[PDB]
Amino acid sequence: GPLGSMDSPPEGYRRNVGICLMNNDKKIFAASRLDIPDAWQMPQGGIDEGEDPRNAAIRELREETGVTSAEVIAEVPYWLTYDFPPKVREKLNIQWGSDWKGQAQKWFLFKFTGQDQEINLLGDGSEKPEFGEWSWVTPEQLIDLTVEFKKPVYKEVLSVFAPHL
Ligand SMILES: Nc1ncnc2c1ncn2[C@@H]1O[C@H](COP(=O)(O)OP(=O)(O)OP(=O)(O)O)[C@@H](O)[C@H]1O
């Protein structure tokens, strides 16, 4: 069958955690890039120095979106690992200044229990704004927004969170 997970953080990939948030309409919180038009994605982070995923995610979320009214409804039993192209990799190495093939992250489903006013793409006054906009999309739509190298990594999250969406 499908093979796009990881029951353990492999080598080359840096610690990371994803936060899959959904709306009362059963949509998935998708945010557009602040540098790439039409580039949508979900809030994620490379975990904190010696931080547990579930925490880094719940934390990272309030850092990337600042969403305070959100609770976990699901958690992918495995880790999601992806890779970047020779332009992104080669670019990150200089822009980000890191030498990694990708990032293994354990996506966690979060049910929004607040108001659209809580959604702050900037962050909780910690990190700098990464997204410029956001919208609600179905697990199939968000999949259409995601990129080829991030399709499975996402579909996995949704797939695992299907019963919740
Ligand atoms: N949909 C996309 N289309 C084109 N390039 C993309 C897309 N999504 C990501 N990228 C490229 O990949 C880079 C990083 O990929 P990704 O968004 O998966 O990682 P990340 O958000 O940097 O990870 P993190 O912030 O957790 O450390 C982007 O800066 C961009 O160059």
Concatenated DSSP letters of 70-123:
EEEEEE-SS-EEEE--HHHHHHHHHHT----SEEEE--EEEEE-S-TTT--SS-
* 70 touches 113 (CB < 8 A): yes
Which atom of ligand 1 has the smallest separation from the CA of 44?
26
In degrees rounded to 5, what are phi and psi of residue 10? -75, -175
Beta-bridged to residue 80, according to DSSP, are 105
Ligand 1 cavity residues, CB under 6 Å = 16, 39, 41, 44-46, 84, 88, 103, 147, 150
User: What is the span of the domain harbouring residue 57?
Assistant: 1-165
In degrees rounded to 5, what are phi and psi of residue 147? -95, 160
CATH code, domain carrying 68 = 3.90.79.10
* CA atoms within 13 Å, Cβ hemisphere of 96: 15
- The total number of structural domains in the chain stands at 1
